[PDB]
């Protein structure tokens, strides 16, 4: 039972409601209390921020806020959270041995490959389709045009010959007779096979290497390196990642984008990424990996960087430090932390076969259209028979 703020949104009265807390850190705290006996009273920090060195409106004063403000003010005795270890946090308080090694990485909304209705017609240009159709028509007419005036094949026969030898089917069993028509037909068949081979090769080339956006190569991505209005990336405001981005000199230009777009909590950031509002979210590997495991349409892509570990912090001097560090090291040694990782992180639904039913639906739609137009064609043939 954990007492926490009712409303995470700023500008509302944060009533201390007694909610229920569970998961990884809670189980770790429970074993910590079981090993060395001490009753615990868990509560949430009023301010959702992790807590960084921030200059309050009153100048000449650096104030620790968030969970660190809660701890350092004497209002808390021990802190358990996915808290990254850095120099600034270690200067004022001491951290135990990390219980989970992780690092910073990039989460992006996975782009499902959209299948257009013209996927089969995509490799060839529409003007090219019109040109090949006009060529089919002109060769179909001129075959029997030359054959008719050959003293030494009709409209339907020559037309079906053309369609059969262009579709690699053989609908028209009739053959041209005059030698000029013989040469014309053989060359047109060669042209048709050239066309179909070009179509096959073009479709093979288009289908392979079909990835509009290659990847994100971590922080070294030139697209990420140069900020742009369209490419919007962010991270949780006022947290360890913010400190790392700010203090690193070469990454300072990155920080120039950071204050432009920030989110109060990780939930809002991941929701914005899911709603395609954010192109990239910078966060810990464990959190983003678990979210990708649950949210099957989001994926972590950046190379792992800024390796560190989540630690449990206490005051500057605390008798608990040695015993808790020994206990956490023993927990790593035996088969407990693996059990927590299995039972709270590893389990997943899908993480991610091509040319699915939705991918090449257009061929099925066109077959259905031909089926439903066959009745219209037979009506037209019946009407022609009437005339």
């Amino acid at each position: 039972i954990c007492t926490g703020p009712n409303d995470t949104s700023p500008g509302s009265p944060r009533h201390t409601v007694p909610q229920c807390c569970y998961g990884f850190c809670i189980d770790l705290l429970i074993k910590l209390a079981r090993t060395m006996n001490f009753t615990y009273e868990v509560h949430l920090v009023a301010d959702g921020k992790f807590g960084t060195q921030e200059r309050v409106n009153n100048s000449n004063k650096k104030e620790w806020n968030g969970m660190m403000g809660e701890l350092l003010s004497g209002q808390a005795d021990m802190i358990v959270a996915p808290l990254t270890i850095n120099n600034e946090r270690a200067q004022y308080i001491e951290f135990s041995k990390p219980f989970k090694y992780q690092g910073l990485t990039i989460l992006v909304k996975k782009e499902i490959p959209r299948s257009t209705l013209d996927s089969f017609m995509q490799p060839f240009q529409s003007t090219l389709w019109l040109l090949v159709g006009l060529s089919v028509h002109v060769v179909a007419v001129m075959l029997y045009l030359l054959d008719r005036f050959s003293p030494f094949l009709t409209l339907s026969s020559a037309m079906w010959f053309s369609w059969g030898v262009l579709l690699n089917s053989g609908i028209g069993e009739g053959a041209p007779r005059s030698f000029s028509a013989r040469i014309l037909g053989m060359v047109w068949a060669g042209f048709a096979m050239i066309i179909v081979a070009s179509y096959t090769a073009n479709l093979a080339a288009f289908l392979v290497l079909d990835r509009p956006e290659e990847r994100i190569t971590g922080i070294n991505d030139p697209r990420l390196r140069n900020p742009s209005d369209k490419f919007i990336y962010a991270t949780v405001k006022q947290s360890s990642v913010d400190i790392y981005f700010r203090r690193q000199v070469e990454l300072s230009t990155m920080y120039r984008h950071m204050e432009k777009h920030n989110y109060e909590s990780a939930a809002e950031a991941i929701q914005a990424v899911r709603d395609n509002k954010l192109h990239a979210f910078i966060w810990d590997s464990a959190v983003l990996e678990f979210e990708a495991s649950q949210k099957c349409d989001l994926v972590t892509t950046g190379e792992l960087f800024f390796r560190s570990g989540f630690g449990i912090g206490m005051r500057k001097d605390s008798p608990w430090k040695q015993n808790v560090s020994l206990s956490i090291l023993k927990s790593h040694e035996n088969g407990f932390m693996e059990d927590l990782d299995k039972t709270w992180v590893r389990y997943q639904e899908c993480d991610s076969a091509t040319l699915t039913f939705e991918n090449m639906a257009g061929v099925f739609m066109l077959v259905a259209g031909g089926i439903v137009a066959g009745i219209f064609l037979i009506f037209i043939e019946i009407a022609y028979k009437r005339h």
Binding site: Q91, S156, R247
Partner: protein, 279 residues
């Protein structure tokens, strides 16, 4: 390991429902072909012609005589060539060698129970280290079995693995990662694609209560924040295999011959069934 290829690798180009729906629409098109032929050559001949048009082997078929039947057969052949091009476009990519790990991890039954398996696989570690202590504290039976296949040094274990007198080597994660990276040909690889069991760290040992502890800790964490050991790892810890066409054998396309044998069995079964029905 010598990777294996799934027998149904040539079915993956299209999902299971895709094949059955193309087959049912094939049956529908053959039925309507027979219908339009009768209006203006049985169902079997139509089905054979449709299959031979999809499967452009120039098989002997009897083309219909009606005009509308010819039209719909032509558009069916268009669908057929589209399907063939689509299937052949990605056929090479899907028929590729897939590598399968020998074991799952330190919790595998092979490590825990090595005697029940008929081929005795050999795994060991160097003694007088932290890994040996961890194994002793966790699995005394595993350590007792493993002591026989002991190793003297890292290089001795590596050459033993290379030759074949050893199957697995359990030791510090970073050292094995470095060895796998620096190995030539990448014939050796860590299990689980970077699986780590103890997930401990390397530290700078100090005497109890030494005054240098706090300053060293702060300096190391400052190094963490500036990413210098990232440069150090790129300079020292990276290897060759970290950055990362072949002939098709019988096992690579074993699914095709398996389906051929199944088709032959179906042939014999339906031949006997036709003999019984005719009698």
């Amino acid at each position: 390991s010598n990777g294996t290829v799934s027998p149904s690798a040539f079915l993956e180009p299209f999902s299971a429902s895709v094949w059955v729906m193309m087959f049912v629409m094939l049956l529908i098109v053959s039925a309507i072909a027979v219908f339009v032929f009768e209006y203006f050559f049985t169902i079997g001949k139509a089905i054979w012609l449709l299959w031979g048009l999809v499967f452009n082997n120039s098989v002997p078929v009897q083309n219909p005589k009606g005009t509308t039947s010819k039209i719909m057969v032509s558009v069916w052949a268009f669908f057929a060539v589209i399907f063939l091009a689509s299937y052949t476009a990605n056929l090479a990519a899907f028929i590729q060698e897939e590598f399968v790990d020998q074991v799952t991890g330190l919790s595998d039954k092979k490590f825990q129970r090595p005697h029940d398996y008929s081929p005795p696989f050999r795994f060991g570690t160097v003694p007088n280290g932290s890994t040996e202590r961890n194994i002793r504290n966790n699995y005394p039976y595993m350590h007792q079995y493993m002591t026989r296949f002991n190793q003297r040094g890292v290089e001795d274990a590596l050459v033993s693995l290379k030759t074949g007198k050893l199957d697995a080597f359990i030791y510090d994660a970073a050292v094995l990662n470095y060895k796998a990276g620096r190995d030539e040909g990448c014939k050796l690889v860590t299990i689980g694609s970077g699986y780590i069991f103890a997930t401990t760290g390397y530290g700078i040992a100090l005497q109890k209560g030494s005054p240098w502890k706090r300053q060293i800790d702060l300096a190391l964490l400052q190094f963490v924040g500036d990413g210098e050991m990232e440069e150090l790892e790129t300079l020292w810890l990276t290897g060759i295999c970290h950055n990362e066409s072949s002939q098709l054998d019988i096992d690579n396309m074993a699914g095709v011959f398996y389906m051929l044998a199944a088709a032959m069995a179906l042939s014999l079964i339906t031949f006997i069934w036709e003999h019984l029905f005719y009698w």
